[PDB]
Amino acid sequence: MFEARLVQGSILKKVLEALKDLINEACWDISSSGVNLQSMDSSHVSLVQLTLRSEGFDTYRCDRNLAMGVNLTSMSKILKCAGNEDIITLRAEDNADTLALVFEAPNQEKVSDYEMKLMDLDVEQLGIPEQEYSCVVKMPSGEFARICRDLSHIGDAVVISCAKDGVKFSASGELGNGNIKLSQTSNVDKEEEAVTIEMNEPVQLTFALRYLNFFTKATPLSSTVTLSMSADVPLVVEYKIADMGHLKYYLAPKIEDEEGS
Amino acid sequence: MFEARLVQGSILKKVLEALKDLINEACWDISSSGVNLQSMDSSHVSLVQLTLRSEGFDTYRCDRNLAMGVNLTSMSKILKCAGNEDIITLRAEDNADTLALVFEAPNQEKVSDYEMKLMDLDVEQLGIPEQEYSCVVKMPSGEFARICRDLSHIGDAVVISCAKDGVKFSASGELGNGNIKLSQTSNVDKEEEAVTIEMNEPVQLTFALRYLNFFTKATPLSSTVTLSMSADVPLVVEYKIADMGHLKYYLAPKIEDE
Amino acid sequence: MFEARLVQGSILKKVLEALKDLINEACWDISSSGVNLQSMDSSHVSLVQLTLRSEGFDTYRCDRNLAMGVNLTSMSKILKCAGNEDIITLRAEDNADTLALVFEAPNQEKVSDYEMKLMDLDVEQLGIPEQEYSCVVKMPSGEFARICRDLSHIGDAVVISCAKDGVKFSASGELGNGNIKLSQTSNVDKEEEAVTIEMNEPVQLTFALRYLNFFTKATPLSSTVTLSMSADVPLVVEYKIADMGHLKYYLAPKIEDEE
Amino acid sequence: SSVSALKRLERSQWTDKMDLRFGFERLKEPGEKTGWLINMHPTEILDEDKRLGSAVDYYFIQDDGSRFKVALPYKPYFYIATRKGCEREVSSFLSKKFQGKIAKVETVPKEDLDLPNHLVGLKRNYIRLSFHTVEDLVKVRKEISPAVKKNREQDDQLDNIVDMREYDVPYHIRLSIDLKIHVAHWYNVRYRGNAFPVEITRRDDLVERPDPVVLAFAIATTKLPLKFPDAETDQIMMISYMIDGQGYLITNREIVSEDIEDFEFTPKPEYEGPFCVFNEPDEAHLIQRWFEHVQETKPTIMVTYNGDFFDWPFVEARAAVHGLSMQQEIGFQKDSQGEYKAPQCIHMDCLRWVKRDSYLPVGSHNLKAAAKAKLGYDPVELDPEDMCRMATEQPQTLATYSVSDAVATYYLYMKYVHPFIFALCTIIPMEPDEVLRKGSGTLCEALLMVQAFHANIIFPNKQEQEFNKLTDDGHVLDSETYVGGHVEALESGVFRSDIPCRFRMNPAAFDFLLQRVEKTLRHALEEEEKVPVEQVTNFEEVCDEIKSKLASLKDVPSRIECPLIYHLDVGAMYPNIILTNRLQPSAMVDEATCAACDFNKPGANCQRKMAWQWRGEFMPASRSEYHRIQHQLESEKFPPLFPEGPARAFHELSREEQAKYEKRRLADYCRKAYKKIHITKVEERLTTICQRENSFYVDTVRAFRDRRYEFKGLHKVWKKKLSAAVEVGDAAEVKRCKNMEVLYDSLQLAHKCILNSFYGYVMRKGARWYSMEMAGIVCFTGANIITQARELIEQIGRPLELDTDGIWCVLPNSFPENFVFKTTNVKKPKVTISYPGAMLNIMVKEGFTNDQYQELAEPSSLTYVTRSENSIFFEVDGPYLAMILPASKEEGKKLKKRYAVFNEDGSLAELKGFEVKRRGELQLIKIFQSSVFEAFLKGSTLEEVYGSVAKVADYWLDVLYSKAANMPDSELFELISENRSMSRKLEDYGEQKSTSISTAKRLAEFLGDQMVKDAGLSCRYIISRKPEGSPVTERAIPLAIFQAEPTVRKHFLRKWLKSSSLQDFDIRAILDWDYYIERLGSAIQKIITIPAALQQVKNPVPRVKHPDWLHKKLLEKNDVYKQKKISELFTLEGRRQVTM
DNA sequence: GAATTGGTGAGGGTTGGGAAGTGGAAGG
DNA sequence: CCTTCCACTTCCCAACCCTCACCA
């Protein structure tokens, strides 16, 4: 068996609601060390990684490692049935035809249960460079979300530049130009509102906002997001899920062709 | 002449939208006992009864019977214009082919006054008989509304089952089955918050969930809802309207193909 | 050079959110006295007028009078990027083709800085007529919005009837007919609910609800709406903005020649 | 009864008087005469017992102009079938039950192909019944039909009757099928007195045709201004007509202001058109004089354009107003179907031919258009409102117009209709009225009944429609169908032989062709040409030039070349597929019948199994839910047929009412319980075709194909002889030759029409020989063939358009093209072959060729020879100069069925589906499209081609943006208006919203129900600005109000524009310019600008923007910051699949 | 008594679900 | 008193259903 119980179903709800848009089908790798998911969007421009650690569940059992395929929109549908206060339990077995779920209120006034149908998948696996990044910035997630929405109204592509004084987002289009700027918080009112920039050397990169729009749906997970950037390699955005785990999106940049010539 | 006045004027608004979409046009019967109404689904699978009492109105003159045809969309588009706190007056005549509605603001600084045309209907009716329902359920309304909505995502037919100690709703479909269990409790906080199920003998029956998704529009009329069931007999949903009246929906159980 | 700083940055958003349905492309003009915009609506049914006095801004520099042709859907979209608490600042240069918009977060946490392309326009305009009206009506704006929505539900056009003691609205159509009356208040406890009427001579007039149902889009702009009416002359619907300015719609009365 | 019997005697006598008045003197006297059968009718004749007997009257004409009738008595009959051993008992009851009602009953062996095991030779005894009159048949069948009806549902002597056949064949057709009497043949007839029937026999020796007197006529009437005429109010002004090339005119001096002189009208020297004139003081004299001149000349065919609609009802009513019963004077009376017919002459209407066999678009069914298209001259025109003023102000022009309609009617009838219709009459049992009026599936059915009779087959009963049949999975079906002909537009834009075009090719496909070149030619000569390969000397040389050109292509597969534009299509595909496979409507079988056939043996080669695609649509309710809704109707009750009648329970309704109520209930229930009322389902099916079954259908198709090609060849021979006789100038020989030329040209056209008919008939509702499978198998085999031709062409070159039977493609300039062979035999000394043809043809020959054809060689021994056949062959048209295809406005879609193609001479070769042809579409679109197609020919590069094409599309935008400022006011109304039709009555549409319905109601408000009342109203409207934001349908305003009186216009426009203050009532103010400019923008994008963006050229029309999606794609292409993929930046670790 | 088939474009109206904004009451 | 969550209404786009006339 695999069996897990979660202290609050809102976490797994917010996770599925963040995966639902970007990857339509995926497979989960499950082990006593935790749950891992990695998958690539239908255009290979961006890559999703999710890890939930063994310790964050209220109770956990995993007799053997498992892999199983899930049509994520149907899981998000079933998970629309659970209430925000509910406690949720997952059960599965190595016959791997179905995933059983149980949702209940903290008072056991009511019980809900379901059997999601699993599916078959084939997918390609990528590695990760594990470098240090020439710049990292830590940001209030609601501010990055508004930055993405507002600049997406100006145009389809964003330029991100990190420099010693402050990070800059810029975009332009047929309407004109837009610039949004952040700076080092000198006096911290509260850490969740603080922005911090640390760097080796300044960085300039450009990206398609149509994907960032899909990452910022993670904002209701946690109040702060990590951005990591370095020359000529994918941008990283990272959200942390309590003590349980982390969700990361990698986005490949747009690069100047003239050197290719 | 018929004339009546209602201080809890929002009730007529709430009671009308629970019908506006389920039945296109209806024949109301007016009598000294009160407004009474049997009407039938345009597909004739399901049936409505509305029954007010003349005691509940702030004023009620009815010196003769009337029968009047109305298409409920036309009333609904007018009652949209009434504020929920305003006081409603209704006026009709036995030779007239129109109805007058007056909305009176508690401040007395605003008044409004609408006339709508009747329509010329007649309807052939059998008086709906009593049944000694073997199964009866009282529940908070929002729980039943949530059950019917959430099951609607799984599939279009619900198997409802009952027991001496609870009820079960279940649905089966392309995403896989789903269930909800509601056991009876002895501990209760308040009637608005608590369940009471009684059953003479076990029954389970299959009902079209897209119908219950219409019946659930009555939810804001009452903090509780009554349901009753028996084998080979229509399910009845019942809402109580203060002590001013009651509204009931009748639906036939699905014939199983097996 | 021209620049202005607006600490009440919401009002420029709500103005653009009002104008964008009646006019799609317009030319502003700027003066030492402040900002003006007057323009016929796209269908040429009705006239929109707005001005903001220079006394309303936190600071204002205007070295010469100038005019700026702008697309209101574009400026509306750009201004939807500003938060309601944010400071707005506008600036341009007399020979520039572009208007610069700065939005500052009050805490100085953040800056944002946008440009919009101008376009070149010239437009036909005349000195706006004003005179003593036979009727004036003052009302809570939400009431007038509900009246318009209800009468537009029942009917195509509203007829307004006026008396010393109250004002009445009526309509008729395929659903039937409807009558609504507001009487003058007996005494006022809190002002915004108070309905007050000035009345020199009885007037009754008819108007097309499509345009009043656009005009009411300024309801978020102020809690009190005003109507000025007289026989055989345009209805004026007027909203007053903070201290600094005002927004008026001019709409000619419907003729009833067929009788 | 006796009153009806005397009424039948009365009508028989009256008709005999009426045709005697026209000189059809009945033959009553000993002798022999010969003549040409022109007409026939069924009638009773008084016999020697003074009884009525049913008979047929045959009408003959002679070269000297004499005429006669013959009356031939024949007993109508039909067949009944009975259970084993019933025949003597049932026949004795049939006789005693109806004694004196039936003439003869007898036992007849006949063969029915539906009988089990029938190929061995089994056939069964039917009983024939026959009657002294059809009225006794019509009575007795109604005494039998309940018994066979009940036994047909379930399964006295009536219960022993099992089935009844042939009871509804028309009696006269039953006679022409039986006696082999046929129309447009010379006959010798022998009269022997009433002691014997009259004997008729054909002479084949004579082929010349007589010239039966044909009268064509047309009329013109007064009418109220701006409104239709009606017979109570108006009067005829002129009637103009021609007899056998001589014209006559009558004019009414009550109205026409001057006497008319005789004059001559000749559009072109072939149309002689001399007109003689009669002036009459009174309408009653106009009518009387015309009736007199018809009674003088006594025509045998009478013709007018669409006469059943107007010209007969009006002259009938105006005659009856003065008491002249035209039914008595002329004899013409309206039949039950509302069509005028007469005893002595035939009513032929040109428009019932134009609508059926001319292949004209519905754009040009107006007489002046059909004349201009087929006769090659433009006729003369009048505004239909001015005729009433012109009759006063300038009568000569009205006379000229009304004569011109008579000339055009007469010559159009003579050249096209008359040869065709009598040629087709030579091969069908039917009268010339019925052959012209009836639908082609009926003609094909009568022809098949002729052949079935000659084979001694007994016909099936007409198929009867089932209602609400059930799918096996239980859903009630809305519809069943088969998947039709494949289509795909593969490419878009411009192709020309004179521009460089880029090809990429598969060298293994060239190697594959080069390996087989010898086989491709050896087959292409021997099977297609039928020239033996030994008879030709240069065969070994030409193969080397083919192989060396293919090698030179193989060495450089990717290149830039000029294109060759070719059209490659199959000749008579569907008949050839039928003949090749031996498909017959009765030949489809199932395992349940092959279980019975004694020829079902191990290795029996006769079962041919072929694939077709069934399609259904059904409602999602289940079997029990529908059955519950049926039960719910057990308590319902329904109105009577008349307001005072008794209410009907559901079981007392007709089955058509029952099915409609059930469909209404289930359609509402499904809309309540589900979002979606219907589901489509597609299913591959395999069907077994028997290969030994009687070939009468397939052999009929064969015979018509062969005889078509025989007459086509003879027509070529005689047209050469005609050209020689005209060049020599031998007028008597020219006349002889032209007569033979028109005889063969009409015969070949009639055989082409009949050959085309055989496919669709098998799907006609209630056809005798009906089956859906045979139409599916044909459509699917014609989708396979064209698909594989696409696949094979797509490697060599670039296919451009593909429809049901033919491909449009471009091929590289270096391709083989055509080759020549020299023959030792002088009979065919040189032969030419085309390589794209033999290339495709050998591909067809390998896959499709049938190898299971069987034919009965010895009827006494049941030995069948087994044979292969292929009759499908491709042929090549072109090569053409230029080809153009449009592109869709939506992303990635491609417009099927729209293109233009040009001959090498720059004359337009084809132009298909475009709005220039359509009826109703806006005239500005017609002119824009027509001019741009011509403009595409100019220039030498894509840049220059589009630089030319742009200006013609700019001109119209320039005009519209200028509000046509300088264009005359009368021009806009023709430029800006639609003319859309309306096929139904205005009440019949129901509550629908559309622009035509709107503007018909907008006429009803303005001139009353007098104007809407008739079907087929034409609606001319413009779409207007002033009701701002009102949806499009509500802004449609008739053109008529711009012709109406000023004080009516200034009222109705003020009402309709919802603008009481409106001062300006001018189209130039009212016009919604931004609607018409959006229409033109919708057109111009599909042809000139979007295709340009698909061919690597910048937007050629600055004023029109691209669609947003295309602007996004073109903007993303061009920026320097190229998007990398993640797989190119991070290391790929592997690939995995997950499975349980 | 009557009765050819299927497939496509163009223009227009109706129906249903998701996204965004506003108001209340509920919780800390 | 201030912030968050849930409920209800409005706005916008896509897909289906109607007509007629032409390509095979």
Ligand SMILES: Nc1ncnc2c1ncn2[C@H]1CC[C@@H](COP(=O)(O)OP(=O)(O)OP(=O)(O)O)O1
């Ligand atoms: N009026 C009609 N009714 C039914 N099917 C029809 C039809 N018109 C066309 N079809 C269908 C069935 C036939 C098919 C057209 O292909 P073929 O080669 O058989 O006809 P064609 O090109 O006229 O003959 P060719 O000139 O090459 O000798 O379209």
Ligand code: SF4
């Ligand atoms: S197809 Fe062959 S087996 Fe079938 S019925 Fe015909 S002859 Fe017999």
Ligand SMILES: [Mg+2]
């Ligand atoms: Mg062909």
